[PDB]
Design a protein around this nucleic acid. Structure first.
Ligand code: SF4
Ligand SMILES: [Mg+2]
Ligand SMILES: [Mg+2]
Ligand SMILES: [Mg+2]
Ligand SMILES: [Mg+2]
Ligand SMILES: [Mg+2]
Ligand SMILES: [Mg+2]
Ligand SMILES: [Mg+2]
Ligand SMILES: [Mg+2]
Ligand SMILES: [Mg+2]
Ligand SMILES: [Mg+2]
Ligand SMILES: [Mg+2]
Ligand SMILES: [Mg+2]
Ligand SMILES: [Mg+2]
Ligand SMILES: [Mg+2]
Ligand SMILES: [Mg+2]
Ligand SMILES: [Mg+2]
Ligand SMILES: [Mg+2]
Ligand SMILES: [Mg+2]
Ligand SMILES: [Mg+2]
Ligand SMILES: [Mg+2]
Ligand SMILES: [Mg+2]
Ligand SMILES: [Mg+2]
Ligand SMILES: [Mg+2]
Ligand SMILES: [Mg+2]
Ligand SMILES: [Mg+2]
Ligand SMILES: [Mg+2]
Ligand SMILES: [Mg+2]
Ligand SMILES: [Mg+2]
Ligand SMILES: [Mg+2]
Ligand SMILES: [Mg+2]
Ligand SMILES: [Mg+2]
Ligand SMILES: [Mg+2]
Ligand SMILES: [Mg+2]
Ligand SMILES: [Mg+2]
Ligand SMILES: [Mg+2]
Ligand SMILES: [Mg+2]
Ligand SMILES: [Mg+2]
Ligand SMILES: [Mg+2]
Ligand SMILES: [Mg+2]
Ligand SMILES: [Mg+2]
Ligand SMILES: [Mg+2]
Ligand SMILES: [Mg+2]
Ligand SMILES: [Mg+2]
Ligand SMILES: [Mg+2]
Ligand SMILES: [Mg+2]
Ligand SMILES: [Mg+2]
Ligand SMILES: [Mg+2]
Ligand SMILES: [Mg+2]
Ligand SMILES: [Mg+2]
Ligand SMILES: [Mg+2]
Ligand SMILES: [Mg+2]
Ligand SMILES: [Mg+2]
Ligand SMILES: [Mg+2]
Ligand SMILES: [Mg+2]
Ligand SMILES: [Mg+2]
Ligand SMILES: [Mg+2]
Ligand SMILES: [Mg+2]
Ligand SMILES: [Mg+2]
Ligand SMILES: [Mg+2]
Ligand SMILES: [Mg+2]
Ligand SMILES: [Mg+2]
Ligand SMILES: [Mg+2]
Ligand SMILES: [Mg+2]
Ligand SMILES: [Mg+2]
Ligand SMILES: [Mg+2]
Lengths: 137, 231, 208, 149
RNA sequence: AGCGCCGGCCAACUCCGUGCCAGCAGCCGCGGUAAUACGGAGGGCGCGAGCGUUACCCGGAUUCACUGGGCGUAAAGGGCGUGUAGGCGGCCUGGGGCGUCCCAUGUGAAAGACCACGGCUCAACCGUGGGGGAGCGUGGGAUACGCUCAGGCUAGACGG
RNA sequence: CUGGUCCACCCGUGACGCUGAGGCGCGAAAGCGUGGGGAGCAAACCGGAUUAGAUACCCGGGUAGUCCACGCCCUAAACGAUGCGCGCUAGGUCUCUGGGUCUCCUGGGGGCCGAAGCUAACGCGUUAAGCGCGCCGCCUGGGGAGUACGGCCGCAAGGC
C-alpha cells in the first residue's frame, strides 16, 4: 500500500456507490482528522473506532437522500464526488491566496496546515495555507 | 388483521437461486431454501395494508396482475369480489404505456358483444361469422378483466414481480405505485410496497389476496363474508 | 468616411424602420410603408431560414446603421465598453448615446443624425461655450450643448427648435428652446431608448 | 405552451433489393425561456412528421433548470459516450458563449449568461444528450443544505 | 470612391456565353450542350481611403493533454525473469524545522500593461498619481503533511 | 540430484517493502559449426497425372533436416493481441487441490453466467477492460519502412 488517504477515500466512494450502510478502514490519526472534517460538513453521518481481528479500525456511517420515483428509485448521493489532490508522486501545496473554491461554494477542500486539518473556508478565515488533501462535493 | 396465521400457510420459498438484495427479509437457510422473517412480513404488511386502505377510501382503482399457473383462479375471484380490474392470462406488452391503443381493442370487444345478439343480424356469411367468433373468443380471453379499466390505474397489485417484470417496468415508468408479493428471488427496489411472502404456494396467495380484498371491501362500507377457499 | 448612398434600402433590408431621413420617415411615403421587402431582384421571394450567424450579423448591422458609425469605430467602442466595469450591453448603449452628433439629434437641433453630423462638423454647435466640430466627441454628464451665438438666427435651426417646442426630450436630457441650449444630465438608461435591438445578440456576435 | 427550436435534421438510409430507402430524423428542443426545457428525437418517413414527433417527445421529457440571475448555480462537467460538455456560470453581461446545439438548449431554458466548451466527440445528438444530463445534475445551495444538514 | 465576395463552411441570385475546352480551387470539389462553383451582365452582401493576396507566429489543435489524452480489437504493454541507479512507501511517541505555510523588511529601475484624474476642439498621443507583480536576500513564527534523527508496534515482508 | 508453490500451527525477526532506465540470465520452430546417428517422415530435387499452362494442390520416389553432444543464432499471431504490486466493489454455477466443527464453513488455482460500474461498440465484470495509488515500457494520420545511413552484435543467414 502506498497512499492510505487515497485508499480511505476510495473505500468511501466504493461503499457509497452501492448504498452500503457503513464501511471499515484501517485506523490512523490523520484519517481520523479527515473523517471529523467530513462529519462536521454533513457528508457522513459519523464515524467510530472498533476492533477487527484485534486491529484498530474506523467505521464510517454513510448518508443518502430519499427514495426516488421512476425507472430508477435509488436515492441520490450526498457525496457526489470525492477526489485526492496531493499524491505521493506529486505533492500539491497552495498559499492562502491560491486556495481553490470548490463548486462555487457548494463543495469543500481539505487542507493540512500548520494549524491542523481545516476546510478551505476555515483556512481562509485563519489566513493560512498548506497541503491540499482532497476535494468533496 | 393477519395475527400470526402466516406460519400455518407459508414461511417462504426458493433455495440458493436467490437475489441478494432480498437479504433484509431472510432469517435462515435450513433445508437449503430461505425462510422469510415473519416479523418483517408483518411490519411491511401493516404499511402495505394502510396504503391500500387509504387508496380504496379515495375511490382509486387497483389493477390486480397475476398470470402464473398457481394464480389464474385466485386472482380472478379476488379481483371480481371488489369489482376491480385484473390481468390473469397474459400481460400484453404496452397494456399501460400504450393504454389508448390497447384499450381500442375493448371497443371492438364490446361492439362484438352487441353484434352476436339475436335481434339485429344473423345474415353474415358463415366464414365471416367464424372469423368474427375467433376474434371475439380471443378478445374475451385476453381482455375480460382489462375491460373494467376506464383510465390508467392508481396502483397495480402483482403476485410475482420477477415473473412479471414487464408490468412492473410499465408501472414504474408511468409513476404508478406497485404492490407485490415476492419470494427470495425478487428485486425489492422496484417494488414500492413489498410483502415478503411466498408467492408460489396456493394458500399463501389465497390468504394475502383474500384479506387484502376484505380490507378494500371494508373501505367502501360493507362486509361480504364468504370467499372461495379451495384446498 | 461614412455611408453616403441610398438610405431606405437599409430599412428595407433590416425589415424595420430606421428613422434615418427625418420628416419623410413619419410621412405616408416612407419606403417601409410601401415596399417592406428587401431591395433587388429577389426581394419578393420567400425567405429562407436564417442561420445563427445571419441573425447576429443582421442585429449588429441594424444597431450600427441606426447611428451611422463605421465598423472600426463601432468595434473600438464595443471593446472599450467590454473593458469597463458594468453590464457591457448597457455600457455600450450609453457610450453610443454619448456621441455629440447623436446628442444634438436628440436635443432637437436636427431632424436626423446625418443632419446632426453636418451641423456639428460645420461649426454650428458649442459645448460649454467653446466650439466643437467633431461628431465623435463624447459628452460627459453636466456638459452644456448649445447652438453657436452667431448661429441662432439660422432658418434651419429656427424651424427645428420651432417644431420641438411641443416635443419633450428624454429624462436623461434637458432642453431650453427659448435659451436654445441643452444639458446632458446622465447616461441614458437601457429602458429609455426605444431601440429595436437585442444587445445580447451583438455581444454574442463579437464573441465569435 | 412553449417555444420550439429545430436543432437537427438528417436523412438516413437503409438498403433492400431495389436500392436505398430513406428516413428522416429530427432533433427538436422545446422550452419556455423561464426554467423548463426538453429534448426530443423523432424519426419518420417524412420531414414534417419527424418534426412533429420530435416535439411530441420533447414535451414529455423536461428538466427544471435551477436558474439564478440568468446563469447556473455552479460549474458542471458531463460525459455522454465520448462527448464532453463543460458549463460555467458568468456575469450578467457575458451572454451565451456556446456552440449551436448547447446554445439552443440553454437559450430555450432561460439561460442568458454562460460559458461552455465541447470536448471530445462533437456529434450533435450526443452533445445535446450531454447538455440535458448536465442541466439535470444542477443543484442549488438550498438543495445541498437540505441534503447535508 | 474603391476593393473583395455571392455552391457549403459563410452574408449575398438570376440571365446569357461556353461544353472535361476555356478556366476556378483553402478543403469538399466545379466544368463532358439547360453551370446559383468558369467568363460577362443585372442585382446583392461585407468593408471603405482602403480592399484583397503571399510569407511568418499564436489560436481554433484537449492534435505532446501540468491545467487537459491514451495503449484487448482503432496508433500504442517490452518474449520472460533477476536486478543496478533512480522514483515511491505501514501504525504510535518525542526532538530538529530542510521542504511547506504565515508575518515584517530590502529588492523587483524607467518606459510598457491596469485604475483614476488631467492637456492637446475629440481620438491617437502625452502628463501626474496610485496599485499591483513571479522570483530572490534578511529577521521572526507554526509543525498538520513530506524529510530527517531517536524509541517503540506487528496488519506488509521474510523465517521456523 | 534440484527449483518453485500451497495449507495448518500463529512460534521467531521487526517495515527488512514495491517498481525498475542500463547490466546479466533464459528464450518454440527454422537456421549455422564440429563429431555421431539415420527407422519413419520430408524443404530442395526427379518422375506421373491434372490443366490453356501447373515451376502447385493429388500420386511414386528423394537429399538436407527432423534425433544426440557441445558451441552459436535470439526471432514469432514469443497472444489473454490485456506490464507488475497492493487495497476496495452483489452473487450463481462447474472443476482441481488443502484444512476443519467433513450437512456446511474456511484457504489456494482453473472455467462459465451475471450486481454496480465501465466501453465507440463488441464485450469486461473479485482471474476487471470497475474504483484508486506507486513505478516501468510504449503511441501521436496512411504509404515510403522496420527501409536507408551511422553504430553495435553474428561464422553466415541476419538481429538491435
Ligand atoms: S422613410 Fe422609412 S424607409 Fe426611408 S429612411 Fe425613413 S424610416 Fe427608413
Ligand atoms: Mg513525489
Ligand atoms: Mg421502459
Ligand atoms: Mg459520442
Ligand atoms: Mg472517454
Ligand atoms: Mg476528435
Ligand atoms: Mg447563406
Ligand atoms: Mg469552379
Ligand atoms: Mg473568381
Ligand atoms: Mg449555360
Ligand atoms: Mg466561389
Ligand atoms: Mg457568373
Ligand atoms: Mg481568441
Ligand atoms: Mg477543431
Ligand atoms: Mg495546445
Ligand atoms: Mg481546445
Ligand atoms: Mg495528463
Ligand atoms: Mg486520443
Ligand atoms: Mg487496444
Ligand atoms: Mg479498448
Ligand atoms: Mg489490425
Ligand atoms: Mg494513433
Ligand atoms: Mg494494434
Ligand atoms: Mg507480455
Ligand atoms: Mg507486441
Ligand atoms: Mg518468452
Ligand atoms: Mg540489474
Ligand atoms: Mg526486483
Ligand atoms: Mg532488465
Ligand atoms: Mg533500491
Ligand atoms: Mg523551513
Ligand atoms: Mg516598474
Ligand atoms: Mg479631456
Ligand atoms: Mg506612472
Ligand atoms: Mg529569512
Ligand atoms: Mg512519513
Ligand atoms: Mg523505526
Ligand atoms: Mg518455479
Ligand atoms: Mg509470533
Ligand atoms: Mg520487540
Ligand atoms: Mg510497498
Ligand atoms: Mg530507472
Ligand atoms: Mg532458441
Ligand atoms: Mg512452438
Ligand atoms: Mg531445432
Ligand atoms: Mg546440424
Ligand atoms: Mg509434379
Ligand atoms: Mg489439357
Ligand atoms: Mg511427395
Ligand atoms: Mg516417402
Ligand atoms: Mg534423407
Ligand atoms: Mg505465448
Ligand atoms: Mg500486444
Ligand atoms: Mg494494455
Ligand atoms: Mg514493466
Ligand atoms: Mg475461483
Ligand atoms: Mg468462480
Ligand atoms: Mg465468463
Ligand atoms: Mg461477464
Ligand atoms: Mg468471471
Ligand atoms: Mg481501454
Ligand atoms: Mg497528430
Ligand atoms: Mg534493421
Ligand atoms: Mg548497416
Ligand atoms: Mg561477424
Ligand atoms: Mg527484422
Amino acid at each position: 500500500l502506498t497512499d492510505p488517504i487515497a485508499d480511505m477515500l476510495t473505500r468511501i466512494r466504493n461503499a457509497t456507490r452501492v448504498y452500503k450502510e457503513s464501511t471499515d478502514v484501517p485506523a490512523s490519526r490523520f484519517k481520523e482528522e479527515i473523517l471529523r472534517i467530513l462529519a462536521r460538513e454533513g457528508f457522513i453521518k459519523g464515524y467510530e473506532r472498533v476492533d477487527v481481528d484485534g486491529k484498530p479500525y474506523l467505521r464510517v456511517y454513510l448518508k443518502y437522500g430519499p427514495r426516488r420515483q421512476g425507472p430508477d428509485p435509488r436515492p441520490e448521493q450526498v457525496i457526489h464526488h470525492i477526489r485526492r489532490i496531493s499524491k505521493p508522486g506529486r505533492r500539491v501545496y497552495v498559499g492562502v491566496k491560491e486556495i481553490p473554491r470548490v463548486r462555487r461554494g457548494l463543495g469543500i477542500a481539505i487542507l493540512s496546515t500548520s494549524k491542523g486539518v481545516l476546510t478551505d473556508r476555515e483556512a481562509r478565515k485563519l489566513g493560512v495555507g498548506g497541503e491540499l488533501i482532497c476535494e468533496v462535493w | 388483521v393477519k395475527e400470526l396465521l402466516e406460519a400455518g400457510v407459508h414461511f417462504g420459498h426458493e433455495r440458493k437461486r436467490w437475489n441478494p438484495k432480498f437479504a433484509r427479509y431472510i432469517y435462515a437457510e435450513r433445508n437449503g431454501i430461505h425462510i422469510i422473517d415473519l416479523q418483517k412480513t408483518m411490519e411491511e404488511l401493516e404499511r402495505t395494508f394502510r396504503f391500500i386502505e387509504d387508496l380504496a377510501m379515495r375511490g382509486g382503482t387497483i389493477l390486480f396482475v397475476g398470470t402464473k399457473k398457481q394464480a389464474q383462479d385466485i386472482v380472478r375471484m379476488e379481483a371480481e369480489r371488489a369489482g376491480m380490474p385484473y390481468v390473469n392470462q397474459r400481460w400484453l406488452g404496452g397494456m399501460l404505456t400504450n393504454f389508448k391503443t390497447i384499450s381500442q381493442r375493448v371497443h371492438r370487444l364490446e361492439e362484438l358483444e352487441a353484434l352476436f345478439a339475436s335481434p339485429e343480424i344473423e345474415e353474415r356469411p358463415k366464414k365471416e361469422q367464424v372469423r368474427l367468433k375467433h376474434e371475439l373468443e380471443r378478445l374475451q380471453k385476453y381482455l375480460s378483466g382489462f375491460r373494467l379499466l376506464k383510465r390508467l390505474p392508481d396502483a397495480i397489485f402483482v403476485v410475482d414481480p420477477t415473473k412479471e417484470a414487464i408490468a412492473v417496468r410499465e408501472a414504474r415508468k408511468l409513476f404508478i405505485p406497485v404492490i407485490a408479493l415476492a419470494d427470495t428471488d425478487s428485486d425489492p427496489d422496484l417494488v414500492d410496497y413489498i410483502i415478503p411472502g411466498n408467492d408460489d404456494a396456493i394458500r399463501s396467495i389465497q390468504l394475502i389476496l383474500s384479506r387484502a380484498v376484505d380490507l378494500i371491501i371494508q373501505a367502501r362500507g360493507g362486509v361480504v363474508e364468504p370467499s372461495p377457499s379451495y384446498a | 468616411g461614412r455611408y453616403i448612398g441610398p438610405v431606405c434600402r437599409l430599412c428595407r433590408r433590416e425589415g424595420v424602420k430606421l428613422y434615418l431621413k427625418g420628416e419623410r420617415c413619419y410621412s405616408p411615403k416612407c419606403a417601409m410603408e410601401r415596399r417592406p421587402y428587401p431591395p433587388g431582384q429577389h426581394g419578393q421571394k420567400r425567405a429562407r431560414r436564417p442561420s445563427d450567424y445571419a441573425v447576429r450579423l443582421r442585429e449588429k448591422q441594424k444597431l450600427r446603421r441606426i447611428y451611422g458609425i463605421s465598423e472600426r469605430q463601432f468595434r473600438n467602442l464595443f471593446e472599450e465598453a467590454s473593458k469597463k466595469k458594468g453590464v457591457t450591453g448597457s455600457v455600450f448603449l450609453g457610450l453610443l448615446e454619448s456621441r455629440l452628433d447623436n446628442v444634438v439629434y436628440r436635443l432637437g437641433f436636427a431632424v436626423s443624425r446625418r443632419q446632426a453630423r453636418q451641423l456639428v462638423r460645420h461649426g454650428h454647435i458649442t459645448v460649454n461655450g467653446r466650439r466643437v466640430d467633431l461628431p465623435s466627441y463624447r459628452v460627459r454628464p453636466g456638459d452644456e450643448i448649445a447652438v453657436a451665438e452667431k448661429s441662432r438666427n439660422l432658418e434651419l435651426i429656427r424651424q427645428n427648435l420651432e417644431a420641438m417646442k411641443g416635443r419633450k426630450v428624454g429624462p436623461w436630457l434637458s432642453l431650453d428652446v427659448e435659451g436654445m441650449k441643452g444639458k446632458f444630465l446622465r447616461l441614458p438608461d437601457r429602458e429609455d431608448l426605444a431601440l429595436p435591438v437585442n444587445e445580447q445578440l451583438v455581444i454574442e456576435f463579437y464573441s465569435r | 405552451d412553449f417555444e420550439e427550436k429545430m436543432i437537427l435534421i438528417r436523412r438516413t438510409a437503409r438498403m433492400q433489393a431495389g436500392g436505398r430507402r430513406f428516413r428522416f430524423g429530427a432533433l427538436v428542443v422545446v422550452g419556455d425561456r423561464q426554467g423548463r426545457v426538453g429534448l426530443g428525437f423523432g424519426k419518420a418517413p417524412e420531414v414534417p412528421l419527424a418534426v412533429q414527433k420530435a416535439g411530441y417527445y420533447a414535451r414529455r421529457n423536461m428538466v427544471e433548470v435551477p436558474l439564478q440571475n440568468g446563469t447556473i448555480p455552479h460549474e458542471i462537467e458531463v460525459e455522454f459516450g465520448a462527448s464532453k460538455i463543460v458549463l460555467k456560470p458568468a456575469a450578467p453581461g457575458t451572454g451565451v458563449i456556446a456552440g449551436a446545439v448547447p446554445r439552443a438548449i440553454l437559450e430555450l431554458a432561460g439561460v442568458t449568461d454562460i460559458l461552455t466548451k465541447e470536448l471530445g466527440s462533437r456529434n450533435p445528438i450526443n452533445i445535446a444528450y450531454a447538455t440535458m444530463e448536465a442541466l439535470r445534475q444542477l443543484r442549488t445551495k438550498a438543495d445541498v443544505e437540505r441534503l447535508r444538514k
